[PDB]
Amino acid sequence: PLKLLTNHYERCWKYYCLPGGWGNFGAASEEELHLSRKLFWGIFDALSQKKYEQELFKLALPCLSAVAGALPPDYMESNYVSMMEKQSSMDSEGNFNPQPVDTSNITIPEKLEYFINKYAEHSHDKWSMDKLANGWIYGEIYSDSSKVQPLMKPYKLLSEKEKEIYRWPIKESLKTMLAWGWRIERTREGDSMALYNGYSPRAIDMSNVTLSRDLHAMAEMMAENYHNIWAKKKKMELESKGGGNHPLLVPYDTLTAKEKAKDREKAQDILKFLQINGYAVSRGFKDLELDTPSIEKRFAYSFLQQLIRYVDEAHQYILEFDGGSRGKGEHFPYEQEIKFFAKVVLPLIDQYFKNHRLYFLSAASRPLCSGGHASNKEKEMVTSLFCKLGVLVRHRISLFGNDATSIVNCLHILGQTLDARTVMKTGLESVKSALRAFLDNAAEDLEKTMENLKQGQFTKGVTQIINYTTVALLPMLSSLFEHIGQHQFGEDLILEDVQVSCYRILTSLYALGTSKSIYVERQRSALGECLAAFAGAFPVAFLETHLDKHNIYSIYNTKSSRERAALSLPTNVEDVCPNIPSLEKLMEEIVELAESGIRYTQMPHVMEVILPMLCSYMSRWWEHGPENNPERAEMCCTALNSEHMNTLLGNILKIIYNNLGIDEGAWMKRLAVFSQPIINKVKPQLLKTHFLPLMEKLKK
């Protein structure tokens, strides 16, 4: 069943997630959605409190991921529940307990007696027509040989006990649905009609009557009840007989159409006769209220609290393991919980946030206008989970069974899924402070890595944590900057004291890019791409301050003079970002690299890093410069011209022509890969008449 559920929920995911679903097939009836939610939660809890079996845990995780993907993250948890669920019917012993509903306590109201009598007359009439069609004729004595029956008299001349035989099924059929609560009323139409008021019986050819579609469902349930009743007293006959299992004892669902035919027919005939009398039947329950605005009932909400506190005791268990590391016994009952964590929680996070990338980013902003609204406090707790995962992965590489790569993967895609709604309008102060304590702690962690690498260059714990830093932390923060840049959330997400932390991280990365070692060689890509992010598409103007004093967003201008002089705020841009060279310096450096063209053997990291930088701040401001809007000039953070990209791109592809001669490059392919976005943003018909060398140098 695990594999069956996985395959079904992977193949038919659109049927559940998309409001339209499959065009031909349709969409769920919300009952399938309730069943899927119950299955997901049951499997998740059972796996949580289940002992680790490798095969079972490797088959259960795909099922959970598929069910989570199929379930809409904005799913509506109905307060309405099901009618007396038949869980005990499919019990382990016997496989079928046919318990019916009890109707002894309930009593039928009096006004229904006219309906009861009329339907009894109708049943007697069809009875007579059937067997004077078979050939039975009224006689005074009951003889089987001559097929004559004294009971062939009209309903009025029938004896009282003869009327009761029709009445009994009628009143039980009414009481089973009255005790179920279904409201039966009768209109002013029937009331007017009731006021209006050998026999030849002529019953209504009721076959032409048809029911409403809800009425078909109601007839189905009441037929299932009738079959449960029959199976119940049949089963009692079976234990009285001590065997002889009836082939039709199988449940209603297992029954076939031919077997269901008579029971259904009884359902339709009784309901259609009720309609033809004009009695109005309806559902037994009043809809009380639907609490749509409530985030509590959100599936993503429930999933996130589950994930949130699971990571919570995971982190405090890791604290307990750190405290017991002073001891001798590392074996604990929590091995089950940590394998559960590393094998389910992280992969489930990854698959869920891959499948629902759009949901948590845009709360029905414009993609998928049908829905996809992610709640705002759901957004802030997504950010809180981001922070807490970042803190948990801090200094636990040995405890992780080489799954730290998976943790970094989940963490960076979650960073991509991060969105800034909460920070713009409303965000919990504790969550804000916690996650940006995460940011600054990453800052001084990278710092203490640089000082310990400068104190002792030899490369244990400090070495593995330096590898952790250069593998996770810098690519992580760079992907953070990437998604903020692509979403244009920078200039308003990174307003206050965050820009101080960003100058700190910036200076740290800058000393990293000026320093060289084997770890720096390993992190060449991370350094290049983060500094990239920085220096042609990045939110702040860290190079050009000369026009930043006029920027309204500018840090010093946003926070006046009082607190700036008071706090650890260095009172000058060059003071807060000292080791950073200016634009004049960092672009005369680019031009001198151009006419120089150093061999890759002497000064490699410069031409391996220096171009993508220019690629992700420089064109933040190629769109943002005056070349796009003559108004709002001198309000801009910096001034940067399409001719400036023309010069710098001429520079870069000329030094690429110089590049192709030095061992043909995996890293000049670094710059090429990161430059297709740059040159694609570049206005193409500049690229024509300037691309002439690149095709002969490229087919070389």
Partner 1 sequence: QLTEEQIAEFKEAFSLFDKDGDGTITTKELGTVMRSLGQNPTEAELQDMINEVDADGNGTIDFPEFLTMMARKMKDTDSEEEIREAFRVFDKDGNGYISAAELRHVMTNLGEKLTDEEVDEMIREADIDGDGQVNYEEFVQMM
> How far is residue 71's CA from residue 37's CA, in Å, rounded to a whole number?
7
DSSP-derived 3-state class of residue 25 = coil
Least separation in angstroms between residue 586's CB and partner 1 is: 24
Among 672, 686, 687, 694, binds partner 1 (CB under 8 A): 672
Q: For helices 474-487 and 429-455, give the axis angle rounded to 10 degrees.
A: 140
Toward partner 1, which CB reaches closer, 174 or 342? 342
Toward partner 1, which CB reaches closer, 566 or 666? 666
Which region among 33-41, 272-280, 666-674, 680-688 touches partner 1 (by CB under 8 A)?
Answer: 666-674
Toward partner 1, which CB reaches closer, 328 or 699? 699
Least separation in angstroms between residue 497's CB and partner 1 is: 33
Q: Looking up tokens 């035919």, which residue turns up?
A: 261
Q: Please give the structure tokens belonging to residue 359.
A: 């949901």
Toward partner 1, which CB reaches closer, 405 or 641? 405
For every residue of 16-60, DSSP letters joined together read: HHSSS-BTTTB---SHHHHHHHHHHHHHHHHHHTS---HHHHHHH
> How far is residue 485's CA from residue 618's CA, in Å, rounded to a whole number?
13
Least separation in angstroms between residue 23's CB and partner 1 is: 24
Q: Which of residues 536-555 bind partner 1 (CB under 8 A)?
A: none
For every residue of 386-428, DSSP letters joined together read: HHHHHHHTTT-TTTTTSTHHHHHHHHHHHHHH---HHHHT---
Which region among 11-19, 28-36, 86-94, 663-671 touches partner 1 (by CB under 8 A)?
Answer: 663-671
Among 552, 666, 692, 695, binds partner 1 (CB under 8 A): 666
> Is the Cα dihedral 594, 595, 598, 603 positive or negative?
negative
Please tell me whether residue 2 binds partner 1 under the rule CB under 8 A: no
Q: Across the strands, what pairs with 280? A: 185
> Is the Cα dihedral 93, 95, 98, 99 positive or negative?
positive
Please tell me whether residue 673 binds partner 1 under the rule CB under 8 A: yes
Strands, E assignment, 291-378:
none
Among 117, 306, 525, 647, binds partner 1 (CB under 8 A): 525
Q: Please give the structure tokens belonging to residue 432.
A: 């804000």
Toward partner 1, which CB reaches closer, 500 or 672? 672
Least separation in angstroms between residue 673's CB and partner 1 is: 5
Toward partner 1, which CB reaches closer, 172 or 403? 403
Among 551, 670, 679, 682, binds partner 1 (CB under 8 A): 670
Q: Across the strands, what pairs with 138? A: 149
> How far is residue 581's CA from residue 592's CA, in Å, rounded to a whole number?
15
Least separation in angstroms between residue 364's CB and partner 1 is: 27
Which region among 255-263, 377-385, 599-607, 668-676 touches partner 1 (by CB under 8 A)?
Answer: 668-676
Q: Across the strands, what pairs with 128? A: none
Toward partner 1, which CB reaches closer, 262 or 669? 669
Please tell me whether residue 412 binds partner 1 under the rule CB under 8 A: no
DSSP-derived 3-state class of residue 228 = helix
Least separation in angstroms between residue 384's CB and partner 1 is: 28
User: Residues 501, 553: contact at Cβ < 8 Å?
Assistant: no
Please tell me whether residue 664 binds partner 1 under the rule CB under 8 A: yes
Least separation in angstroms between residue 666's CB and partner 1 is: 4
Q: Looking up tokens 């060059």, which residue turns up?
A: 574
Measured over all CA atoms, what is the biggest interatomic distance in the chain, rounded to whole angstroms?
127
Strands 148-149 and 184-186: unpaired
Least separation in angstroms between residue 343's CB and partner 1 is: 16
Which region among 89-97, 359-367, 380-388, 662-670 touches partner 1 (by CB under 8 A)?
Answer: 662-670
- Residue-level length of the chain: 700
Question: How many chain residues interact with partner 1 (CB under 8 A)?
Answer: 7
Instruction: Show the DSSP H helices in 539-603 as ranges.
Output: 555-558, 562-566, 573-576, 583-596
Q: What is the DSSP letter of 184?
A: E
Toward partner 1, which CB reaches closer, 55 or 429? 55
Least separation in angstroms between residue 511's CB and partner 1 is: 24
Strands 279-281 and 184-186: antiparallel
E strand or H helix that includes residue 234: helix 213-241
Toward partner 1, which CB reaches closer, 164 or 663? 663
> How far is residue 100's CA from residue 252's CA, in Å, rounded to a whole number?
13
DSSP-derived 3-state class of residue 76 = strand
| Of residues 62, 87, 98, the one with CA closest to residue 234 | 98
Least separation in angstroms between residue 537's CB and partner 1 is: 18
Torsion angle of alpha carbons 337, 340, 345, 350, nearest 10°?
Answer: 150
Which region among 17-25, 150-158, 669-677, 678-686 touches partner 1 (by CB under 8 A)?
Answer: 669-677
Toward partner 1, which CB reaches closer, 67 or 408? 408
Toward partner 1, which CB reaches closer, 122 or 670? 670
Among 147, 448, 585, 669, binds partner 1 (CB under 8 A): 669
Binding mask 218-257 for partner 1 (x = CB under 8 A): ----------------------------------------
Toward partner 1, which CB reaches closer, 626 or 665? 665
Q: Which residues bind partner 1 (CB under 8 A)?
A: 525, 664, 666, 669-670, 672-673
